[PDB]
Amino acid sequence: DVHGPDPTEESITAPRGPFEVDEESVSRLSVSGFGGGTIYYPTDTTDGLFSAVSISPGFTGTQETMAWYGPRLASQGFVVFTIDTITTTDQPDSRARQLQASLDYLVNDSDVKDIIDPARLGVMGHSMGGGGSLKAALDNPALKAAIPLTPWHTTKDFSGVQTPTLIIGAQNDTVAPVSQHAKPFYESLPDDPGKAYLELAGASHLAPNTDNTTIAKFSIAWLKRFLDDDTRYDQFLCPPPENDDSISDYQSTCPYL
Numbered sequence: 167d168v169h170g171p172d173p174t175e176e177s178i179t180a181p182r183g184p185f186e187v188d189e190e191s192v193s194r195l196s197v198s199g200f201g202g203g204t205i206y207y208p209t210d211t212t213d214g215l216f217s218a219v220s221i222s223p224g225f226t227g228t229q230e231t232m233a234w235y236g237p238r239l240a241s242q243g244f245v246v247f248t249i250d251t252i253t254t255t256d257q258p259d260s261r262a263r264q265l266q267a268s269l270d271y272l273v274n275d276s277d278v279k280d281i282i283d284p285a286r287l288g289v290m291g292h293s294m295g296g297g298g299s300l301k302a303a304l305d306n307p308a309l310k311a312a313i314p315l316t317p318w319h320t321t322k323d324f325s326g327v328q329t330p331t332l333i334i335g336a337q338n339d340t341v342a343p344v345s346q347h348a349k350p351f352y353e354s355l356p357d358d359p360g361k362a363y364l365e366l367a368g369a370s371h372l373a374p375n376t377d378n379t380t381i382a383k384f385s386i387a388w389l390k391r392f393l394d395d396d397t398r399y400d401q402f403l404c405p406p407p408e409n410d411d412s413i414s415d416y417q418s419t420c421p422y423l
Contacts, residue, residue, distance in 0.1 A: 167213065167214030167215060167283070167394070168390075168394050168395075168396040168398070169185070169213055169214070169216070169242075169243030169394065169396075170183060170184045170185070170242065170243050171184060172398055173390070173398055173399060173401075173402070178242075178382075178383050178386050178387060178399075178402060179379050179382065179383050181237075181238065181377070182237065182238070182241040183241040183242035183243065183386075184241070184242075184243075185208035185209070185210055185213075185240065185241050185242065185243045186208065186209045186210065186241070187206050187207060187208055187209065187236075187237050187240040187241050188206075188207060188209050189204055189205065189206050189207075189236065189237075190204070190205040190207070190276075190277060190278065191204055192204065192205060192247075192271070192276070194250065197267070197268075197271050197275075198267065199263065199264060199266075199267025199268075199270075199271075200249050200250070200251060200252065200264035200265075200267045200268045200271070201249065201250030201251050201252050201253075201264070202249070202250050203220075203229050203247050203248050203249035203250055203268065204229055204233070204236060204247070204248045205245065205246070205247050205272070205276065205277075205278055206236035206237055206239070206240035206245070206246040206247075206248070207240055207245045207246070207278050207281065208240060208241070208243055208244075208245075208281075211281060213243070215281060215282060215283035215286075216243055216244055216245050216281055216282060216283065217244055217245070217282075217283055217286035217287070217288065217310070217389065217393035217394055218244065218245035218246075218247065218269070218272050218273075218278075218282045218283075218286070218287055218288070218393075219239065219244060219245070219246055219247070219287070219288040219289065219290055219311070219389060219393065220247045220249055220265050220268040220269050220272070220287075220288075220289055220290070221235050221246065221247065221248045221249065221289075221290045221291060221295075222249055222251065222261045222264065222265050222289075222290070222291035222292065222294075222295025222296075222298050222299065223248075223249075223250070223251065223254075223291070223292055223293075223295050224291070224292040224293025224294045224295045224296070224316075224318065225254065225255065225293060225294045225318070226254045226255065227254060227292060227293070227295075227375070228250055228254060229248040229249060229250050231292060231375040232248045232292060232374075232375070233248055234376065234377045235248060235290070235385070236248050238377070238382050238386075239382075239385060239386060239389065242386050242389075242390070243394075244389060244393070245272065245278055245281065245282050247268055247269075247272055249264065249265070249268045251264050251295075252264065256294070257294060258294045258295075258297030258298045258300075258301060258318065258319045258320070258321070259298070259301050259321075260298070261291060261294055261295050261297065261298025261299075261301075261302075262297075262298040262299070262300075262301030262302040262304075262305060263302075264298070265289045265291065265295075265298055265299060265302040266302050266305070266306060269287050269289075269309075272287075273287070285308070285310075286310050286393045286394065287308070287309055287310060287393070288309055288310055288311035288312060288313070288329075288389060288392070288393050289302045289303060289309055289311075289312050289313075290312070290313040290314070290315060290385070291314060291315065291317070292315045292316060292374045292375065293315070293316055293317065293318045293341070293342055293371065293374075294318050294319070295315075296314030296315050296316060296317025296318065296319075296333075296342075297314070297317050297318050297319025297320075297321070297347075299312045299313065299314045299317070300312065300314050300317065300319060300321075300324045300327060300331070300351060301319070301321065303324075303327045303328075303329035303331065304324060304326050304327050307328045307329065309329045310329065310330070310392050310393045311329060311330055311331075311332075311388055311389055311392040311393045312327065312329045312330070312331040312332070313331075313332045313333075313334065313385055313388055313389075314331070314332075314333050314334070314348070314351065315334045315374040315381070316334065316335060316336045316339055316341075316342055316347075316348065316369075316371050316373065316374055317333065317342060317347055317348055317351060318341070318342035318347050319347065319351070322350045322351065322354065323354050324351050324354045324355055325354045325355070325356065327355055327356070328356065328359065329359075329392075330359050330360040330361070330388070330391070330392040330422070331352075331355055331360075331361050331362075332361070332362045332364065332384060332385070332388040333348050333351055333352045333355075333361070333362070333363050333364070334348075334364050334365075334366065334374070334381060334384070334385075335347075335348035335349070335363065335364070335365045335366065335415075336365070336366050336369035336370055336371055336373050336374075337365050337366060337367055337368060337369055337414040337415075338368065338369060338370060339369070339370065339371045340370075340371065341371035342371060344365060348363065348365075349363065352417065357419040358419070359392075359422070360391075360392065360418075360419055360420075360422035361418065361419050362384075362388070362403065362406070362416065362417065362418040362419075362420075363415065363416065363417040363418070364380070364384055364413060364415075364416050365413065365414045365415035365416070366378070366380060366381070366412060366413070366414065367411065367412055367413060367414035368414075379412070380410070380412040380413065383402065384402070384403075386399075387399040387402035387403050388403070391403060391422065392422075400421070400422060403418070403420065403422065404418065404420035404421045404422060405418075405420050405421075406418045406420060
């Protein structure tokens with residue numbers, strides 16, 4: 167199943183896509199292995215199953231720091247789960263296990279299990295949650311997309327990740343400098359099935375925590391392309407964008423074939 171009309175620059179950069187959305191709060195007390203969260207999902211049941219993505223915050227962060235991704239991404243035809251971790255001080259490998267527990271909940275137990283395609287699952291996360299997204303993909307090669315946002319991890323070698331991975335760095339990140347975190351992660355990844363490194367010009371470590379048209383556009387394109395196998399979105403990814411004031415660097419293994 168693909169979803170929505172043929173995309174444009176306007177459609178992919180808009181605050182909302184064509185799908186109306188609702189939200190379901192998931193109590194910490196009703197789940198195991200993570201801290202609960204918010205499920206954002208399309209209300210249209212006539213368009214086939216949707217792909218699903220779980221989104222982790224970073225160190226000292228809660229789902230509030232990632233809330234804006236919910237409506238923005240789900241309105242493009244995705245089930246989006248902004249999670250809380252067990253404790254805000256959980257480290258990356260723990261965040262990876264909690265991302266996976268959240269996807270297991272969505273597919274096995276959640277009240278949206280019947281509108282998800284359990285074969286089309288992805289992970290995203292901020293900072294230590296971005297390190298968690300890399301580790302979760304390493305441990306679960308069935309995951310069809312990963313988007314680490316200003317990622318942080320002591321582990322540098324993600325050569326084992328077979329999931330299409332878009333790393334978003336912040337040019338001026340003083341917390342997870344791109345020379346020590348995002349770029350090494352990106353360089354370790356295999357060239358197939360597809361990778362990209364998008365560096366946000368002028369951006370701090372906390373750029374991912376507020377509505378960002380560049381983060382939204384490329385995340386939507388990446389999830390469309392790799393969770394839905396929707397090649398209508400290759401046009402935004404490959405060849406890489408050239409004259410985007412918001413992008414200080416872009417590296418890729420385009421084309422994705």
